[PDB]
Design a binder for this molecule. Structure first.
Ligand SMILES: [Mn+2]
Length: 603
């Protein structure tokens, strides 16, 4: 313990032994255990400023906020370098990259050997989920990136409080991360260390996560995707719960009754926008509050209800496109205490990203910016070269509590009971504005066949994040629905939504954003037994008179444009579904084929 600079409050022999093994391998100059305190956060931020990784933003424009820009090779998750190394290839499935675990371990051994020379190893303890929640789990991330440490502080419950939960023998998800850039004696560092060679590896049987070469987002903040979705989905398959790529919101109606919805979108900002939706005119008595905007851990309880927690403590959101029109709650969240990554820098020390011009007088672009590559940027350079000031995948990192619409139960260890699931997508035709599934199986089918416009399929929005065979995951969901039904409780309703039906002129007809409240309210009306609708091939959809249009000029003709179901359109759709089910043929539940046949027979 002393050889690792181990704090006296760490009483977990298995943890210390593992850290010792990883220290012997990675050979850091020093070891620092993060306590998660505000003072530590401030010290690390100043160190990032001194290193040039952070620029501190103008305190008058964005208090206690920082801007980091990354190496152009290291700007996003690299799915081609992400591996599920289950013992058997079939347990990775056709949606994951696989390698024999022994071969990958022998591949990573020489990369991690001495990877942290000349650097500090940060021991980052964290809880995914409220501390001590029965739905929460602990991870430890070893990282040589102080950027990882400060972002993990915001994104997780991080620090010394974790060891109270862990105790002397509690288990944890072991995570090891290196930027893959050992420093020699006298060698000068760079502002964004990284390696052109990257590996993001998961060993499900042992819950291990190994990440080499990237300092960025989902590759390096190992709680968010690697733990919260890939490892956790395996744990949930074994222990009877779900780890989903879903926002969680609470919605209260004028009577005061509160419902909770979990929703998966294939979009970059769809969940964040929907999860912080501000009710438009005509809904003065409604409230929408955010439990989470990205990850949901959902555990059935004895009462036949599904209880979801958000396992994260902050938002790691895509910045471009965010403004007061599309997402004012998000804009308000990032007014301060935020870490921005790869957005642009203004001449007065503020940040900017494509889309903020919607809030500016005359919708005017700034005259000059420093773009995420450190290059001069002007509207003329953009207009003539297409250069973006902010990277398309640029991010804000901010505490959940900065969101003014944060739900008061966001940190409740019991979670919230899910009344409905929503599965979205982008479809110019075919898919109506909103459809309610007639049965659990038909809802799983909707989730399994989610697509975005050619139409790319993203079942459950989990295509990059499934921890095991996607088909077995389908079966997990079906088996869950059987158990819930057997409790006699009311099942969560399952909806499909599509904000992006196009007209004859090729333009979107549904205004979206806040107006999506009119669709969400129909779901609540349905849950309460007051909502009406007509039945069609794929499910039940509202008629024009079943939605509240107060405060929105939207005609029955426009409504028909975004809700019309065409026999020929869906005949083509099912052909696309068949191709998907061919890729996922292994262990594909028969209920999916039976559901497709029923849609065919009904057509
Ligand atoms: Mn996500």
């Amino acid at each position: 313990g002393l050889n690792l600079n181990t704090p006296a409050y760490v009483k977990n022999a298995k943890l210390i032994a593992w850290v010792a093994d990883m220290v012997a391998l990675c050979k850091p100059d020093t070891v620092y255990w993060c306590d998660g305190s505000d003072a530590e956060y401030q010290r690390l931020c100043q160190q990032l400023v001194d290193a040039g990784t952070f620029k501190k933003l103008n305190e008058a424009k964005r208090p206690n906020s920082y801007l980091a820009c990354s190496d152009p090779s290291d700007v996003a998750r690299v799915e081609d370098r992400t591996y599920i190394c289950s013992a058997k290839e079939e347990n990775a499935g056709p949606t994951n990259n696989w390698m024999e675990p022994s071969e990958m371990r022998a591949t990573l051994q020489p990369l991690f050997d001495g990877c942290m020379r000349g650097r500090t190893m940060y021991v980052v303890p964290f809880s995914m989920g409220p501390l001590g929640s029965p739905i929460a789990h602990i991870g430890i991330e070893l990282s040589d990136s102080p950027y990882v440490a400060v972002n993990m502080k915001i994104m997780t419950r991080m620090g010394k409080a974790v060891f109270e939960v862990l105790g002397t023998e509690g288990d944890f998800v072991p995570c090891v991360h290196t930027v893959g850039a050992p420093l020699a004696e006298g060698e000068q560092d760079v502002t964004w260390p990284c390696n052109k060679t990257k590996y993001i590896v998961h060993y499900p049987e042992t819950r291990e996560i190994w990440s080499y070469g990237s300092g960025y987002g989902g590759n390096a903040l190992l709680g968010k995707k690697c733990f919260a979705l890939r490892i956790a989905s395996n744990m949930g398959r074994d222990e009877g719960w779900l780890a989903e790529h879903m926002l969680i919101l609470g919605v209260t109606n004028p009577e005061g009754k509160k419902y909770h919805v979990a929703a998966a979108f294939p979009s970059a900002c769809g969940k964040t926008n929907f999860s912080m939706l501000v009710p438009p005119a005509g809904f003065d008595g409604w409230s929408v509050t955010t439990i989470g905007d990205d990850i949901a851990w959902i555990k059935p309880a004895a009462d036949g209800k599904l209880y979801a927690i958000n396992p994260e403590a902050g938002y790691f959101g895509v910045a471009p496109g965010t403004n007061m029109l599309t997402n004012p709650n998000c804009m308000l969240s990032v007014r301060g205490n935020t870490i921005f990554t790869n957005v642009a820098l203004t001449d007065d020390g503020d940040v900017w990203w494509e889309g903020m011009e919607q809030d500016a007088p005359g919708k005017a672009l700034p005259d000059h910016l420093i773009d995420w590559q450190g290059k001069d940027w002007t509207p003329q350079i953009a207009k003539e070269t297409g250069a973006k000031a902010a990277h398309p995948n640029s991010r804000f990192t901010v505490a959940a509590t900065n969101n003014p619409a944060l739900d008061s139960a966001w940190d409740d260890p019991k979670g919230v009971a899910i009344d409905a699931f929503i599965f979205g997508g982008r479809r110019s035709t075919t898919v109506p504005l909103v459809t309610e599934a007639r049965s659990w199986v038909e809802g799983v089918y909707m989730a399994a066949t989610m697509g975005s416009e050619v139409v790319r399929r993203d079942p459950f929005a989990m295509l990059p994040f499934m921890g095991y065979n996607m088909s077995d995951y389908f079966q997990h969901w079906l088996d869950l629905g059987k158990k819930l039904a057997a409790s006699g409780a009311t099942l969560p309703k399952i909806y499909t939504t599509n904000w992006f039906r196009k007209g004859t002129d090729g333009k979107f007809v549904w205004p979206g954003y806040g107006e999506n409240m009119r669709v969400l309210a129909w779901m609540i009306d349905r849950i309460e037994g007051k909502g009406q609708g007509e039945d069609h091939v794929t499910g039940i959809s509202p008629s024009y008179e079943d939605l509240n249009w107060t405060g929105l000029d939207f005609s029955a003709d426009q409504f028909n444009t975004v809700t019309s179901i065409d026999k020929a359109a869906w005949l083509k759709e099912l052909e696309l579904h068949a191709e998907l089910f061919k890729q996922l043929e292994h262990h594909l539940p028969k209920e999916l084929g039976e559901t497709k046949a029923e849609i065919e027979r009904r057509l």
